[PDB]
């Protein structure tokens, strides 16, 4: 069946999803993630959207403001809105899957609620495709592809010009923060390109 989602866990607990379509396949994935890592995922959702001070307090206000200032939510929603129905299924499947398991947890919290929700004094909320996309955007795009120190480099360069004069300041800048160094060990051999 097309309605059927079979979940097989191995000897390490690693889940394997058997499904006939995209929505059913990602639903399965979402469901086991909510089983295994709900508190982690929930905290990762608040970290990536700047909503930590709500449940954690005063100490996270600066964190929250810094997260929010580094993105444009509306630009993310517009990319979601432009997806094709097959692409959209992946994200919707996933959020739906998770929600399925959050509903059981919130229905029977005496046995299903992750201990840490009790510790931290809050409960899980339902997810939407925007939430799933923000997990990737916030921890892959902002962690490993958002690197610059250009304003700081300019400050440094200004200090070198005040020390060695204009031309000399610039040549020292190139000794400390060169653009390229032709002796750097490379992944692709020079014969290749």
């Amino acid at each position: 069946s097309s309605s059927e989602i079979k979940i097989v866990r191995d000897e390490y607990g690693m889940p394997h999803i058997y499904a006939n379509d995209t929505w059913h396949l990602f639903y399965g994935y979402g469901y086991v993630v909510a089983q295994d890592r709900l508190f982690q995922m929930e905290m990762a959702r608040r970290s990536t959207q700047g909503t930590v001070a709500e449940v954690l307090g005063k100490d996270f206000v600066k964190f929250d403001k810094d997260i929010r200032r580094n993105y444009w939510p509306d630009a993310i929603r517009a990319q979601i809105a432009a997806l094709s129905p097959e692409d959209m299924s992946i994200l919707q499947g996933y959020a739906d899957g998770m929600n399925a398991w959050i509903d059981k947890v919130n229905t029977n919290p005496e046995t299903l609620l992750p201990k840490q929700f009790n510790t931290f004094g809050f409960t899980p909320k339902r997810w939407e495709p925007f939430d799933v996309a923000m997990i990737f955007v916030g921890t892959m795009a902002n962690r490993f592809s958002d690197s610059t120190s250009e304003i700081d480099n300019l400050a440094l360069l200004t200090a070198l010009k005040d020390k060695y004069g204009v031309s000399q300041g610039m040549a020292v800048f190139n000794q400390l923060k060169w653009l390229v160094n032709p002796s750097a060990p490379t992944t692709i051999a020079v014969q290749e390109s």
């Binding site: 508190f39 709500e54 997806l83 120190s149």
Partner: protein, 557 residues
Amino acid sequence: SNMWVIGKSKAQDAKAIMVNGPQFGWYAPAYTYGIGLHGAGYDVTGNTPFAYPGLVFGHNGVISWGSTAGFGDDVDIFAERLSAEKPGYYLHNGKWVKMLSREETITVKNGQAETFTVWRTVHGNILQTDQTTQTAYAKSRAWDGKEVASLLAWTHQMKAKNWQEWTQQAAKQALTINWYYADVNGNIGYVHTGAYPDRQSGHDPRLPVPGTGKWDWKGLLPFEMNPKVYNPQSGYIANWNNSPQKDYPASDLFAFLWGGADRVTEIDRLLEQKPRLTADQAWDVIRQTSRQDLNLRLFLPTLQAATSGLTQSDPRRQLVETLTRWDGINLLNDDGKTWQQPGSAILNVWLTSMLKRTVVAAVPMPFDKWYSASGYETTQDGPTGSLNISVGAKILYEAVQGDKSPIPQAVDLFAGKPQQEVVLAALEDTWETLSKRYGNNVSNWKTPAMALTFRANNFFGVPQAAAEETRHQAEYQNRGTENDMIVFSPTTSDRPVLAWDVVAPGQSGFIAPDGTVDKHYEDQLKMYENFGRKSLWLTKQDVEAHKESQEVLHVQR
């Protein structure tokens, strides 16, 4: 984050071997998530950070893939021109253009709520403003508006069956990331992926540009420009966040450089050493590189030359002889707390002293603090990520190369003194410092080993577990957060593919309301520590053969 891919000509008893060690810090519950997906065109196994829809590490029975951070320059800062009068406007292509703005309310548990405004221009969100210059800085990313497409390219690549299909997906990944390929036929490939700006002539990408119009990127460079190799003449692909190719410019971070001193050399040395490598030998490079001191190799020749005319009773000569006798591999003593050899402690003190006399001295305060680190960092919990060669140390390496270095030495870092004299003075400092704490008998120096901590707070500094959930490993290992190995066409099996991984502490982070920990909460922790690994299953018969449970759902959209 390291990777080594071994092709047909270098592989022994297989056609292709892929070993990946993505380095993201050590966390509890695991940074990555193990998952197999069978249906709707997908047939994959692997693990991936934060259970993203697409698997960063894994295989589909035909091809295997992996990644390492790219570090290309894909972000530039635009100095936006504001008017004192007419506010929330900026000058662009001779017109006063209005900024996008949004108000935000920060709700606070047990405190007052707080609201602020976020501003945006054609160039990107505003970072900071200087109302004295009447300048605002907008951060411009080459991947702005391709965030969602990057995620989907990472998902659709799981279905590729060849290089041709695989690179069609690589072309849509817009973040600065290295992508790696291996297949059942022994083919191996590499792509430095990402969206890179087509800059205006004379644009120095290390420093801000005016955002008034003339400095605006021309667009993005085509994918034909992205460094890539397919079936390299060497028979292998190695990376440890080093330069992809000759003359490729790195990130503009002051603290990031691609120079002659690079930790990828440690991997190359080992892969060139044996004509062919088996899977166990390929796995084994994780153990060696985990334990290797990164500075030994770079500065031993320098220290040897400087102490060559010294007497045996000279303590500064003694210290160099200790290092000469050492292979650079750190091993714990029986006590589980100290290192067998004092080499790393010696190099750490020496290098700090050398930096203070050379690089630090040439830079004005407080920019001098950027170059003073030796790269031996740590606290009680050990390093937060990988060990690398510090920026100061890469700059000092070029200086000690003299004229063999391609980097023009505008200021002589040795400030008119012969090199040997600065080296010997730093060695005297080393001896004075270390002898004071450990005594004069270098042979009984019991130096502190670095440790490993699986942190309860995620990389942002936000709790993702209770504080008590924090795990500790005695030996610090400079390796992946997870390690995965894929072996194509073993001669050893009937199976066309073999794959292994380790996801510590475990698969599950579940703790029941009563304090009952899942069965799979920490069953991979000891395996991690002793360089062990678990089998990754793909086919139905393997999955069936190893099943521990089944759950069937009947759902309709």
